[PDB]
Amino acid sequence: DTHALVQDLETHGFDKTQAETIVSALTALSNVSLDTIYKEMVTQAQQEITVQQLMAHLDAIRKDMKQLEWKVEELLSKVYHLENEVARLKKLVG
Amino acid sequence: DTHALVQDLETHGFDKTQAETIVSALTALSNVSLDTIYKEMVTQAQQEITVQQLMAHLDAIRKDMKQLEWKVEELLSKVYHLENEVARLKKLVG
Amino acid sequence: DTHALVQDLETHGFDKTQAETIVSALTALSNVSLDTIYKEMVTQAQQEITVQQLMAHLDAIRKDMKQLEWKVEELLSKVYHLENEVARLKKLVG
């Protein structure tokens, strides 16, 4: 912050005006630089949103896979029951 | 950029040489610090490439999931058809 | 880093104390800015770790996918074999 920096310069061989204008210049470049960085780079907030979205895709796929697994298990049981019926039929006619 | 900053210092109790050397120091640190940031941090253009790659992986898995779903559906239709055939056969053999 | 900057100021119309306090101010703002940037933005090192974690989730899903594929193959074989048995049975009774 401004005070303790302007305060420091004044008490180490600078004027009021010299210390404030120096600090005005430091702030000026700081703020334009940060502004350029925040625009060009990826913020942690943007990253968090992207990651949540990718985890939402992964969760939807996992959910589908579970459902398909359950549907294959049901088909397997029905196939089992038909195998028994068919084996029984073969015996009757055979 | 340089001008209005050196201009400001000179007109607030600094020399030509004092204002330029100050500004030379600000530039020096700004430029090395930015250079270190632009190298160490992720740009939007790099993010986009990474995200697209992750979305391509997710799309391939979704596409494999769809094909497997279709293949289970086919199996389902065949099992249904065998259920009906077997029920018909049981009827014939009395 | 500090030296050649304090050295430059002194030799261009500044004191020992004036040159060091200026440089102390440049360091102060540099370091708070960088600290704010490192907290708010995504580094390449962070990105690599996040990407590896997402790829570990994708690899777990691809692994589960293979096991479900195997299970569909086992259903398919059983369904195919029942189709043949049934086709044969229909001929015998038909």
From Swiss-Prot, chains A, B, C:
Family designation: Belongs to the CCDC90 family.
Protein name per the record: Coiled-coil domain-containing protein 90B, mitochondrial
Parent sequence residues shown: 62 to 126 of 254
Keywords associated with the record: Coiled coil, Membrane, Mitochondrion, Transit peptide, Transmembrane, Transmembrane helix
Oligomeric form and interacting partners: Interacts with MCU.
Predominant subcellular localization, coarse grouping: mitochondrion
Cellular component GO terms held in the UniProt record: mitochondrial membrane; mitochondrion
Upper lineage: Eukaryota, Metazoa, Chordata, Craniata, Vertebrata
Gene name of this polypeptide: CCDC90B
Organism per entry: Homo sapiens
Subcellular location per the Swiss-Prot or TrEMBL entry: Mitochondrion membrane
